[PDB]
Chain A
Amino acid sequence: EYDRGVNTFSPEGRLFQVEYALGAIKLGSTAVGICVNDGVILASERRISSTLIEKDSVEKLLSIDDHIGCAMSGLMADARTLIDYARVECNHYKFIYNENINIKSCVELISELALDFSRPFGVALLIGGVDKNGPCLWYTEPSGTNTRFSAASIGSAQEGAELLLQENYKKDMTFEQAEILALTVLRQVMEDKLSTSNVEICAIKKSDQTFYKYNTDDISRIIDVLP
């Protein structure tokens, strides 16, 4: 093995520290984001320890701006650094220019913090917003390779949650068919019961273009359907 170096090439032609960092995003809490023709829904999964952890004091859907919401996974201690850096470079873009930052011009800069030429970041984000050109949902990796996902999922249970989205996705879906899909997949890959304090989803519609965290009162409006 050649893991002693921070950035050394393998005989088969691949990195090692970046490859080892990819094995750190499959240990945190799961998450799932679904994109539609008029918005984006990001369903997270709260994995609180006990009644001592105050609810709303810990969350997994941090906001980058007023029009861009994102999830996280991996080393949560290092996830509040890229998001804190994305909260600066996005507002710095809103000061030089005046329009909302495009996701493609935001995900490409948040992936630019994976430069090691310090140790690489073991964070796997799920940035999704409605910046321009319709709503988009992206998914970055510790390797810096970004892809535009239509319905992705990160976290511990992202292996069973990925193919489950391929068995229920429809291109012409609505918010009622998205919010149901964003929660019917979380009930399958789960170790607890989907109560009113186990999901902290948020949606960014295309009409108002602003994000809106779903409180515990409106979360009962979707979990009562259960198809």
Chain B
Amino acid sequence: YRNLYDTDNIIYSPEGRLYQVEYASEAIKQGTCAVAIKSKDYVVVSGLKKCISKLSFPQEKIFKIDDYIGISMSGITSDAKVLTKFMQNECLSHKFLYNENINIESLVRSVADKYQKNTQKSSKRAFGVGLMIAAYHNEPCIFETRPNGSYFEYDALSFGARSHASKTYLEKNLHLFEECSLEELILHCLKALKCSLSSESELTISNTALAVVGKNHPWQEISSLQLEEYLSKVK
């Protein structure tokens, strides 16, 4: 427990861990909550903005890559706008060098190496961020990355301050696959935020960004005049 194996990206600990990368995987827990549900043919994303001050407008959490690929960062912002631009340029170039859409599984492999090639060197540090790539190509899939190069084609995710409270809500909810119910799927995803929202506080009055993407749906950002009629007024 001499803690000498803690300030470099090259030194390995005697237990086998790499503590400089493990600190970045812990940096995604200090971000706002987010959750994405995968239906049979639709994919939603419930991003919670971080309204810092009273006068300041809330920060943006949900972004866009193409018409069908949309991400939602959860971590520091300085390493999110760089990974978004070094994803969009790897997306529009595929629609320019070729003409079909970019294969979502072949896109994430080019983003995982943006983490991996940024870790092995010593002058460069690991990306402290956690992406949630939500896309639909032929089948709706919800991919996600990590500071360490690792992929898991999920079905229901969570990243955030109270991510464990929303994780438990999806652990006991496996009835999202069979019945799609687009009008009710966003109710489940919005419930995932409300069940883990700042120790019994409301903060859902047009402060939680939503996005839906599916079969004939492009990356439609849910308008501010549509998520508060009944989507935010269920219980």
Assess A/B contact in the complex (Cβ within 8 A).
yes
24 A-B pairs with C-beta separation under 8 A: A2-B6, A5-B8, A8-B20, A9-B128, A12-B26, A13-B23, A13-B24, A13-B128, A15-B76, A115-B82, A117-B123, A117-B125, A143-B76, A143-B78, A145-B59, A145-B78, A147-B52, A147-B53, A147-B59, A148-B57, A149-B55, A150-B57, A166-B54, A169-B55
Query: A10-37: which have CB < 8 Å to B?
Result: 10-15, 18
Q: Say yes or no for A151: interface residue by CB 8 A criterion.
A: yes
* B53–chain A nearest beta-carbon distance, Å: 7
Q: Say yes or no for A100: interface residue by CB 8 A criterion.
A: no
Residues of A within 8 A of B156 (CB): none
Of all chain B residues, which has the CB nearest A104?
B60
Bound-state Cα–Cα, A152 to B57, Å: 11
Bound-state Cα–Cα, A8 to B10, Å: 12
Q: Which interface class (under 10, 10 to 19, 20 to 34, 35 or more) fits B?
A: 20 to 34
Residues of A within 8 A of B29 (CB): 13
The interface of chain A, by Cβ under 8 A from chain B, is 2, 4-5, 7-15, 18, 108, 111-112, 114-115, 117, 139, 143-152, 162, 165-166, 169
Residues of B within 8 A of A8 (CB): 7-8, 20, 125
Total A-B Cβ pairs within 8 A: 82
Cross-chain contact A9 with B23 (CB below 8 angstroms): yes
* B86–chain A nearest beta-carbon distance, Å: 12
Cross-chain contact B124 with A117 (CB below 8 angstroms): yes
Residues of A within 8 A of B176 (CB): none
Cross-chain contact B78 with A144 (CB below 8 angstroms): yes
Residues of A within 8 A of B124 (CB): 117
Q: A2-B7, A4-B7 are in contact. List 11 more A-B contacts (CB 8 A).
A: A8-B7, A9-B24, A13-B23, A15-B76, A18-B78, A117-B124, A143-B76, A147-B52, A147-B53, A150-B56, A151-B55
Which 4 residue pairs of A and B lie closest in terms of their CB atoms, listed nearest first? A13-B27, A9-B23, A144-B78, A148-B57
Residues of B within 8 A of A11 (CB): 6, 23, 26
Q: Say yes or no for B30: interface residue by CB 8 A criterion.
A: yes
Bound-state Cα–Cα, A117 to B115, Å: 12
Cross-chain contact A9 with B53 (CB below 8 angstroms): no
Tell which of B24, B55, B126 touches A150, judged by Cβ atoms closer than 8 Å: B55
Cross-chain contact B55 with A145 (CB below 8 angstroms): no
Q: Say yes or no for B204: interface residue by CB 8 A criterion.
A: no
Q: Say yes or no for B220: interface residue by CB 8 A criterion.
A: no
Cross-chain contact A147 with B128 (CB below 8 angstroms): no
Q: Say yes or no for B77: interface residue by CB 8 A criterion.
A: yes
Cross-chain contact B55 with A166 (CB below 8 angstroms): yes
